[PDB]
C-alpha cells in the first residue's frame, strides 16, 4: 500500500525528456558480439541496453524486477576473486552468461562500527549494498546497479566451482566443525577474519555487473570532498568554509547537472552514513552531462545511534539542490509516506529479510529531517531560485 | 631433379585407399544442407556490418569446396587442386573482419596470474574472414627462426610458433596422413587487415603504438599477468600463419577426446605412462581402444608429434559422423619445431610401449628414409611455395631425418620382441 | 566466613616442604652478586637517561626482595608479605620508562602477512619500569569480561586477555604451586605512563588519536596485516595486567623447553599424542622424562592449564640452576579463561595418558573440591583484592569447580586400571 | 691513477659547511635502542653509515666505512631472507650476521642485452647492473645521494631457499627440465614461471643495496616529480606540451627556494647519463626541511640501452636551464681525456665481485651522454647568459 501509493504520486511519473541515438550507450548488436555463440534476451542484457543518459533503468521496469529474481536463484557457474580492491569481492558467473559482484556477510545485523574506527577501516557489508539499491530506488535516483541477497552454499557454490588457486587454498574447517574461508585481498583477509557458515552457508549480496568497460568506458572522478585517508593529517574542505565557492569554478563543476548530481549523491551518502565516497564514476561516451553511478555502497549502515554530519558538509557549503529531489525529500517526510515504512516494504522482498535491523530503518527518517532542515536553514540565507534550480519545467 | 615431384609420383602415393568411398555417408558435409546454412550466415553477416554490393555466397569458393571435400579418408584429397587454391586464397584474399574466436571469449573474465597452466583460451590468436566469406585461425610470429624454446621452459609455457603451424601442414601432406587443416604463411598489415576490420570493442582496445612508433597488439590476459609481451609490426608489417577453418560445428560436430598419454602439466609429477613401461597393456583393454583401430590412429599422431616435437597434445579431436574408427584431427601444432638439437622420445611412448604400427604408415616412413625421397629434402622443397620461406631453418629440417631413423629403429627394434605378426597391422 | 583465610590456615598450607633448604645453593640468586649487577644497571640507567635526584637502588625494594626470595621450592614464599607489597607496588608506583621488550625487537623486520602463526613476538605487550627500578610485563585489555573466544577460533589466533594473566596468578597462589610470577591489574594513563616515558622512536609512532578523540596504540605488525585492531583508552585510561619480571638472564639463566604435548599450530593435522593413547609410554623412556620427576611437573602444568583452558603451552621455561628436578615456570597465561562454557580435555592429555599425579598436588585438588574450601569461592575472594575486580565473570569461576571434578574423576578413573601404586607418587 | 688523480683534483676537496645538532639525523644513542640486546667505534659498518647521514651528503667523500660497508655486503653471512610487498618488481630483503640489512635486486637480464625498442619506460627491467653502476656514477660526480650497493654471487640453495620462512617465496622454488633451480616469487611484474630466475645450476648473481635507516626515527618525505611521465599509453603528459613548463614550476612553494630545482638538476643529469626514465618520485628526510638533497633510489631502470640516448630525461634541464656551478665545473672536468667518465667508471666498477658490471658500450656511452648534457648547458647559457644559469656555490 505505502509503496503502491508512492509510485502513484505525481512526483514519480515525471518522464525523462526524449532520447536520441547519441543518448543510448551502445548498439546492442555490438554487445552480443562480445559473448560466445551461446526480446528473449536474458534480463542482464535488457538491463544493459536500457542504460541511457539519465536513468540507469526505467522507473517501473519489468526486467529490473526479474533481474533481482535471477540472482536469487540462478545456478552458479564460475566464481573468481577480484584483485586490487579494498576488501574481498568475488565475481560470479551464471548459467545465462551473466555475471555479478559478490560481497559476503562479514558482519551481523545488530552490530555497530566501533567508535574508534576510521572511515577507511569500516567493514563492507552486504546489508548496505542491498539497502542502498532500494534507498536509491525510493528516491527515484536510479543510479545504483541492482543488487539482491542470497543464501549461498560455500561448498557447492563457492569452493567446488572455482579454478582460482589463491581463493581455494584458504578453505579450512574450524574447531566448531564449520567451513571457513578468507581469501587473499588486503583488508580483513586472514584467518582471524575468516567467513564461516553454520555449518556451510554464508549469505551475501550479488551486485549486478555493469557492462564491460570495453564498449562502455567509465570515467572516474575524484571527489572534491574526498577525505585525506590519513590519520592526524586534516583535509582541505575541513578548514575553508567557502570551499564550494572555489569548487564551483572548476571546469566541470560550473556546468551540468554537476554539483547538483553530487548533491543528489551527498544526500544519499548521509542517509546511509557512507563516508567512503572518494570517487564517482560516469560513462565517458556521454560527456559531462550525465548522472553519477553510486557504486561501492558497502560501507553504509554501520552506525544507527550516530549521524555522521561530515558527509553533509558538501551540502552545507554549497547550499543548492535539485527541485525534483527537494519536493521528494519533503514528501518522504510525511507520516502517510515516510522512509521507514517505505524502506521496510521493498526490503521485505528479498531472500535476506531482515536486511536492516529496525534502528537503521528508523534512523533513516532522522537523517532525512536533518537534510531537510539544512535545506531550510540555508534557503533563508540564500533564498529560493538561487538554492533550488527548477528542473521540473516539463 | 625435384625430390618432391618424385614422391607424389611414386606408386605408394597413387594406389587406391581401402575401403573405397560409397559417397553421401562418407562425406561428413551434406551438400544441400551445408550450402543452405552457409547461405544464411552470409545473409546474417551482410546486415550486422551494414548496420559496394553485398556478399555473395559462391559454391566455387575455396573454403566451400574444401568443406564439402572432407571425406572419411581425411581432411583433404591426395594432391588436391582445391587445397592448392585454398592456400593461395588465404595468402592473397583481403580481410573483411577480425574477432577473438571462441575458446577464448567464453572465458568471460578470466585472468588468474597464479594459474601456471592457464587454459588454452588466453593465447594470442584471432579468427579472420576473407572476401570469399571463409575463415582461418591466425597465429602471429612469436619467435625468430634461429630461436629455440630456451632451456628451463616446460612444455606448457613453450611458445606458439607460426612457422610450426605451417610446417606441420606440409609434413601432414608429405606423410599422406591428411589430417591437419591447410595452413599458409602471410605478411599482414595489422592496421589495415586486422584493426580496421574488427568490430570487437575489446580488440580495438589492445592496439597501441610503441615508443619506436610501431603498431602493436597483445593478448589481454597474458599482458596483464606480464607472462608474455606484445607483438609489433615493423611498423605495420607482421607475419603470421592462417589455418583454414574446419566446417561449422552445427554441420559437423566434433568431440575433443583426452589423450591417454597426457602430461602432468605441473612443475613436478609424472603420469602413469611416464613410469610404467607396461602402460599400453592397460590401454589395450579400455574402450574404445579395445577395437585395436583407434589405438593405431593414436600411434600415427604420436609419430607426427615426435617428428615436430609437439609435447603438448593433451586432446585430439574427431568428427562424430565417422565413429570410433574415424581419423584424428591434428589441430593446434604451433608448439612443435622448437628444439632442433633435442629429440623428446617420451612423445614416441605410444609406439614404444604398444609396439604396433599401421602398414601404410610404416611404408611411407621407410620410403622417406631413402635418399631419393628423403624427408628433409621433400620438406625443404614443399616449404618453398610459402611466402614465409624459409619457414624451417636447416637444423630443423635435418632433424626430421634423424627423428625418422629413431621411429624406424623403434619399429624394427620391438619387432624382435613380438614379430611382424603383432607389429604390422595390414588392415584394409 | 571467609573461606580464603580458612584455606591458608589449613594444615596442608602450613606443613614444611621436603626436602628442606640448606641455603646458598637453594637460592637461585646469589645475594652479593645480584646486588652488584643490579647496582651497575642503575648506574648505567642514570647516565643514559641524563643524556636523553638520580635513582637509588635500595635493598628494601619489592622486586629486589622478590628476586632474592626465589628458592628451589618456587618463585615466591607461601603467604609471603613480600608478594603482598610487590603486588601493591606494581599497582601504584609511577612508571619511569617503557620499551618494546625483547622477543620482539629482535624480530628486526619482520611482518609476513602470509604467516598464519606468526611468532610470539608480534603481540601487544610492553615492559614498564617503576620508580623502585623494577620492571613488569604489561598486557593491555583486549576483550570485554562477558566475551568468549568465538567459535571458529583456533588456539593460535586466540586473544590476549589481561584478566587471565591475573587470575592465573591467584590460581597459582591458591593451588600452592607457586610458579607463575605475581600479577596485578592496574588502570594506566597510556599518555602519561607509556607514551611520555618511552625513549623508543617506534613506540612514539604507533600512538594516534581516534575519531572519538581517544589515545590509542597498537602492535606494529598485526595492525599492518589487519589481523588485530588498536587498543584505545577512554580517552587516556586503559586497564592491563602487569606481571612481575623474573631476574636477569645474566644472573639466572633460563631454558625454554618444548612441551612434549605441543599442538600442530596448523589449520589441520594432529600431533602424535592426539591420536595415540599410548603416547606417554614413549615419553616415560625419553630423557629427561626417564627420572619420573620432571614428568610430574609437566602433569601439574597440564592441570593448571586445563583449569584455565590454556591450550597454548608450547614451551615451558626452567631455571638451569635447579636442574632436571627444578620446577616449571608458567609464564604466559594470557590465553586461558576464554571459554567458560567449554572444557578442553585435550589439555589434560598428560594426566589422562600417563596416569600419575603428585601426592601433594592431589591433596590440594581434593581439598579444593569441598564446600568449606571450594575453588570458585576462594578464587572469587582472592580476586577481589585487585583493582580490576571483578577480574573473572561468574561463569568462569564456576567452571573451575566443574573442571576440577574432571581432573579428580580422571585420577580416580585411571586409578582402577593401575591402582594407587602408579597413580600416586608420594615423593618427598 | 685516473681515479687517484680525480679525487686529487681541487674540485673534489670542497668541504661541506659547518654542522649543528639540528643537521644530524638522529642521536646515535637512539638507534642502538631499537635493536635487541645483541650478541669505542667498533659498531658495525651499517651503523657507522647511518649516523653519518647528515643534511648535505649521505656519506663523507673518502669514508673508510663506505668502502668497508661494500665489503661486508660482498661476503657477510646471510641470516634471513624475506620478500618485500607493494613494489614494482621482485626485491628481496637480506639480514646479516651483524644485524645489518640491505635490499637485493637479482640479475633478471644479461649484460649484452638491450631494452627492446617497443618497451615502454614502465615495462623496462630492473637490473642489478644499474643499481651498482648508479652508486659509482653518483660517487664519481661527488653527489653522494645514493645508498651504497655492491654485487654478490649468491647461492640460491643455502643463501635464498633454505634460509627463508616466507611461504610465498619458498613455494615457487622449482627445478627446471635443464636440472637448474629456479624461483620467481610473487610480485606483480615478471613474477611468473615464464620469467623465473635460474642459476647454472644454483648460483644466480645480484646486487645488495644497503638499507636506509628505519623510517621510525628517520621519516622520509616523498615528492612527486613535476616531469613525471604519465605512465599510460596514448595519453600524453603536461611537460610534453608546454615548452615553458619550468616557468610555472618555479613558482610552486618548494621549488622557488633551495637548493631545490638545483637538486633536481643534479638528479636529471644523473638519470640521463644512465637512461633511467623511471624517475617519478624523489624522497627526502623530513626532519631536515626543504633544504636537503634528494635520495636517488630505485636506479635499476638505467643502463638498458647503450645505442640510444633518451633525450626525454633532459627535458627538465632544457626547460629550466640552470645548474649548480659545482656540478658544471665537474661535468666539464669529467669530459677531458685525462679524466673522462669511461676511464673513471671502469676503474671503480673494476672493484666489485661482479666485473664487468657494465659491458663496454655503456661505459663509453657515458662520455657520449655527458657531452650532450655539457652542450645543452652551453646552447642555453648563450640564450640566458651566465650568472642567470649558473648559481655561485663557493663564496
Ligand atoms: N585450423 C584450425 N586450427 C585450430 N583451430 C581450429 C581450426 N579450425 C577450426 N578450429 C576451431 O574450431 C572452432 C570453430 O567453432 P566456431 O565457433 O568458429 O563455429 P563456426 O564454424 O564459426 O560456426 P558458425 O558457422 O555457426 O559461426 C574454433 O573455436 C577453432 O578453435
Ligand atoms: N612475568 C613474565 N611473563 C612473561 N615473560 C617474562 C616475565 N618476566 C620476564 N619475562 C621474559 O624474560 C625476558 C627478560 O630478559 P631481558 O631481555 O629483560 O633481560 P633483563 O632481565 O632485562 O637483563 P638485563 O638486566 O641484562 O637487561 C623477557 O624477554 C621476557 O619476555
Residue numbers in the entry:
A (entry chain D): 134 to 171, 197 to 552
B (entry chain A): 89 to 139, 150 to 526
C (entry chain B): 89 to 140, 151 to 526
D (entry chain C): 134 to 172, 196 to 551
Question: What does the paper behind this entry write?
Answer:
The Fam20 proteins are recently identified kinases that regulate essential cellular processes by phosphorylating proteins and proteoglycans.
In an attempt to address this discrepancy, we solved the structure of the Fam20A−drFam20C complex that is crystallized in a different space group. A four-leaf clover-shaped tetramer is clearly present in this structure, formed by two Fam20A−drFam20C heterodimers similar to the human Fam20A−Fam20C heterodimer shown in Fig. 1a. In light of this Fam20A−drFam20C tetramer structure, we realized that the absence of a human Fam20A−Fam20C tetramer in the crystal is also due to an unexpected obstructing ATP molecule, besides crystal packing effects. In both structures, an ATP molecule (ATP-1) is bound to Fam20A in an inverted orientation, as we previously reported. Given that Asn298A is at the center of the Fam20A−drFam20C tetramer interface, the bulky glycan addition is predicted to hinder tetramer formation. Nevertheless, both mutants activated Fam20C at levels comparable to WT Fam20A in vitro and in cells. These data suggest that while a Fam20A−Fam20C heterodimer is required for Fam20A to enhance Fam20C activity, further assembly of a tetramer is dispensable for activation.
